[PDB]
Curated annotation (Swiss-Prot), chain B:
Subunit comment: Homododecamer. Interacts with the terminase large subunit; this interaction allows the packaging of viral DNA. Interacts (via C-terminus) with the head-to-tail adapter protein gp4; this interaction participates in the head completion. Interacts with the scaffolding protein; this interaction initiates procapsid assembly, thereby ensuring incorporation of only one portal ring per capsid. Interacts with the capsid protein.
Purpose: Forms the portal vertex of the capsid. This portal plays critical roles in head assembly, genome packaging, neck/tail attachment, and genome ejection. Procapsid assembly may initiate with a nucleation complex composed of portal and scaffolding proteins. The portal protein multimerizes as a single ring-shaped homododecamer arranged around a central channel. Switches upon genome packaging from an asymmetrical conformation in the procapsid (PC-portal) to a symmetrical ring in the mature capsid (MV-portal). This change of conformation may serve as a signal for headful packaging.
Protein name, entry field: Portal protein
Gene behind the chain: 1
Protein family membership: Belongs to the p22likevirus portal protein family.
Location within or outside the cell: Virion
Highest rank taxon of the organism: Viruses
Swiss-Prot record, chain F:
Assigned protein family: Belongs to the p22likevirus portal protein family.
Coiled coil feature spans: none
Species of origin: Salmonella phage P22 (Bacteriophage P22)
Superkingdom of source: Viruses
Role according to the record: Forms the portal vertex of the capsid. This portal plays critical roles in head assembly, genome packaging, neck/tail attachment, and genome ejection. Procapsid assembly may initiate with a nucleation complex composed of portal and scaffolding proteins. The portal protein multimerizes as a single ring-shaped homododecamer arranged around a central channel. Switches upon genome packaging from an asymmetrical conformation in the procapsid (PC-portal) to a symmetrical ring in the mature capsid (MV-portal). This change of conformation may serve as a signal for headful packaging.
Location in or out of the cell: Virion
Subunit structure: Homododecamer. Interacts with the terminase large subunit; this interaction allows the packaging of viral DNA. Interacts (via C-terminus) with the head-to-tail adapter protein gp4; this interaction participates in the head completion. Interacts with the scaffolding protein; this interaction initiates procapsid assembly, thereby ensuring incorporation of only one portal ring per capsid. Interacts with the capsid protein.
UniProt protein name: Portal protein
Length: 569, 50, 51, 51, 97, 50, 50
């Protein structure tokens, strides 16, 4: 039907999608409990003992500790056609705004939820930095998303793991009063409005958190096929460069008074839009956000479809059933030990009567006395043959305890292999690096928007390789995507990687000649010191006089001068 | 076949291969203006659940 | 299309993964297991009989 | 601030050290242990019954 | 609402935050007990024996001893652009205090 | 029974997945969450000499 | 620290870097309060609370 009421559209695409963020989410957030909160559920005040003797944690702890020692980040290799020095520019930028704690933390948060619940996710954001910005007075940042199973929801009928074929991805925020005030501050809103939403949490309510305050960011995407605008490069010839009309609106005047040229073409290109939403109404519609992808990568454990219903899980889910038995039986046994008569003798009051004194616990007497006779008969004090039987813990409890716990650690494994080989969680690391990739298709496709700012024109009486500075605040040619994305060990900085890259090149090479160059190059890369400086400089001079270095020329020019003499003496 | 989809689609298939016995994916094509494989077009491997 | 174990029988196509054979025994495991859980849950504890 | 195991649940912050999980079983140990001590302390020794 | 009474603002941001320094803090400081003070809780004068035969301590002791022999501090590397001798100045200062 | 059971149940979870001596500390995940704070100790220290 | 530094600014991460409060608490002896009121210059006869 036709009903372009915007909120009715957006809300009637969340509502429709939250019918899956039901069947699954219901389970998923429930695992973030048999591990995160407590292994018992839905009573919260009973009179009978309930112990918690889990065995799932240690497994989880193990798995985390493994993924936490194999960092895995992005790579960006060039491409089959492009020039070798294509990646370094981008990579340097990426490495730069992913150094901070947040970038690290956000991922760790995701993988933990990946392991426990089955999902996890983080978002990419941008904003301005005046001091120490990555590029163009701006910086990109990786932000955390807790409880991804119940906050990010995107049934766009998306049929794959990085949710790249999705078009929605509506996420939810819960925030404190002060947080809402500060939020209404940033995005400029009525702080006295107070928002609402499906409420990612739950209905159970035996706690002290009542400040709901949930607002919702709604992302959407459209492959628009926007338009044209080509030009000729005034610099050293080699003309023909293309630009987005949308992105150079107010600029073309200035763009013309510098190298105006002409031609047109229709280019297909995706655009994303973040809209703020409450149940009642929309507070910010169609606000255009940076890149050309929805800035939210999701990690998955075991994932797939069933009845055309999305499905996923972490390690924890299978264990739940047996683990509860363990806890129950265990608690039952505790009752058996606590409330239960101890072994003591049965007496007729009559036989003990007269000297119950002797049976209290004294080691004062040499023996025990018993009344023998009784008028009206000859008493039958058959020496006390009867004691109350000891507490025993039924065979069934014993059996079912051992059974359950075994049954648990049977599935508390992902096919884990020997130490140092074939991680018990390759399949988790891979499904993670898959998301690390979606973290570039998202990052790459977003410098070309914000950070931006690169170009490298080719062409004594000859030269080549010369950078640029562009014009105005944004100005990237449409010949962008020259590097494809790949994953590899995480490094703090480009220099870190280059250093490691050379160490690898060593050992895998003989003590021949090319060893020495690598060896020297290593010293060359070392950072400040008293020890390293002397050696780094020596290695430099060495490499320049080797002729292979080719002077950076801050002074190394003269280093070559006394080298040019060539056995001149 | 570098993109995630090409990878994912196969992994999806093999999992169903192991569990159920079958699995499958499809190849599709369409136009790409920026960064196309060739002739303003690109081929892609799509998933087929169940 | 990928196939695990595949072939024809009565001129009828046929195929299966690892899972199919396990189903029968695995259900028994679950049942017996559940039965036992009942045994532990609902069942009088050991106590004395008195007049 | 340093954290051991940390994360969010019902949009409620959550965290714990190694100690938390152990608490339940450790108390049982101490109790049963104490119970037994009583058994050894207060309890009639083996002696004969005589008229 | 508008109520720029400073203390009412600061106090009404602590009070609001101490509702989490509740559910969790309640537990957290309680562990600094089954280990730090004593493994029994909330009676403190009974007539019946209460032994303390823990096994948690040894684990904790072990964990501490491990982290105590892998010091871990700061580094301050320069940067992709900066000159190599960038860090030493700061580092020297950090190391110092 | 319940004594042996309890104490075992305790040392079951009195471990962070601890590995062999000299390799993979039974507390890498603790050391890391610490070095994370060691980093916040600079963003705090660097941004305070200035 | 579990009961002295408290900072729900709705801070959603581990180094609490996105926080804006972080109110900490001091417990101190009489002589400590006198010496504290000395440093930060305060009425030693006030006696605080929290």
């Amino acid at each position: 039907e036709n009903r372009l009421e915007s909120i009715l559209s957006r809300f009637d695409a969340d509502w429709t999608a939250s019918d899956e963020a039901r069947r699954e989410a219901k389970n998923d957030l429930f695992f973030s409990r048999v591990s995160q909160w407590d292994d018992w559920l839905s009573q919260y005040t009973t009179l009978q003992y309930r112990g918690q003797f889990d065995v799932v944690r240690p497994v989880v702890r193990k798995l985390v500790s493994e993924m936490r020692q194999n960092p895995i980040d992005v790579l960006y290799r060039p491409k089959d056609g492009a020039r070798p020095d294509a990646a370094d520019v981008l990579m340097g930028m990426y490495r730069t705004d992913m150094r901070h704690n947040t970038a690290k933390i956000a991922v760790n948060i995701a993988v933990r939820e990946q392991i426990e619940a089955g999902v996890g996710a983080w978002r990419l954001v941008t904003d301005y930095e005046d001091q120490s910005p990555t590029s163009n007075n701006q910086v990109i940042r990786r932000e955390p998303i807790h409880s991804a199973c119940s906050h990010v929801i995107w049934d766009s009928n998306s049929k794959l793991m990085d949710k790249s074929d999705a078009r929605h991805c509506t996420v939810i925020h819960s925030m404190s009063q002060n947080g809402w005030e500060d939020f209404a501050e940033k995005y400029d809103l009525d702080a006295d409005d107070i928002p609402s939403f499906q409420n990612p949490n739950d209905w159970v309510f035996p706690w002290l958190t009542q400040d709901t305050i949930q607002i919702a960011e709604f992302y959407e995407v459209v492959e628009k096929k926007e338009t044209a605008f080509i030009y000729q490069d005034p610099v050293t010839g080699e003309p023909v460069s293309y630009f987005k009309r949308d992105i150079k609106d107010v600029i073309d005047d200035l763009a013309d008074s510098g190298f105006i040229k002409i031609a047109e073409r229709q280019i297909k290109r995706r655009r994303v839009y973040k809209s703020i939403i409450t149940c009642t109404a929309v507070l910010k519609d169609k606000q255009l956000i940076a890149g050309e992808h929805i800035p939210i990568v999701p990690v998955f454990g075991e994932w797939g479809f069933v009845e055309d219903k999305e499905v996923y899980e972490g390690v924890v889910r299978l264990t739940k059933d047996g683990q509860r038995l363990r806890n129950m039986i265990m608690s039952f046994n505790a009752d058996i030990v606590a409330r239960t008569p101890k072994k003591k003798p049965f007496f007729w009051p009559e036989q003990i009567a007269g000297f119950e004194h002797m049976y209290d616990g004294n080691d004062d007497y040499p023996y025990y006395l018993l009344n023998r006779t009784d008028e009206n008969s000859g008493d039958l004090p058959t020496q006390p043959l009867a004691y109350y039987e000891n507490p025993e813990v039924p065979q069934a409890n014993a059996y079912m305890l051992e059974a359950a716990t075994s049954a648990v650690k049977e599935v508390a494994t992902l096919g884990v292999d020997t130490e140092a080989v074939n991680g018990g969680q390759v399949a988790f690391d891979t499904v993670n690096q898959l998301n690390m990739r979606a973290d570039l298709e998202t990052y790459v496709f977003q410098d070309n928007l914000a950070t931006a700012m690169r170009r490298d024109g080719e062409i004594m009486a000859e030269v080549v390789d010369l950078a640029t500075g562009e014009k105005q605040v944004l100005n990237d040619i449409r010949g962008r995507y020259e590097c494809y994305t790949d994953v590899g060990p995480s490094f703090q900085s480009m220099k870190q990687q280059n250093r490691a890259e050379i160490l690898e090149l060593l050992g895998k090479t003989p003590q021949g000649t090319p060893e020495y160059q690598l060896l020297l190059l290593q010293y060359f890369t070392l950072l400040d010191g008293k020890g390293v400086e002397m050696m780094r400089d020596y290695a430099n001079k060495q490499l320049i006089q080797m002729g292979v270095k080719k002077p950076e020329t801050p002074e190394e020019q003269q280093w070559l001068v006394e080298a040019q003499q060539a056995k001149q003496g």
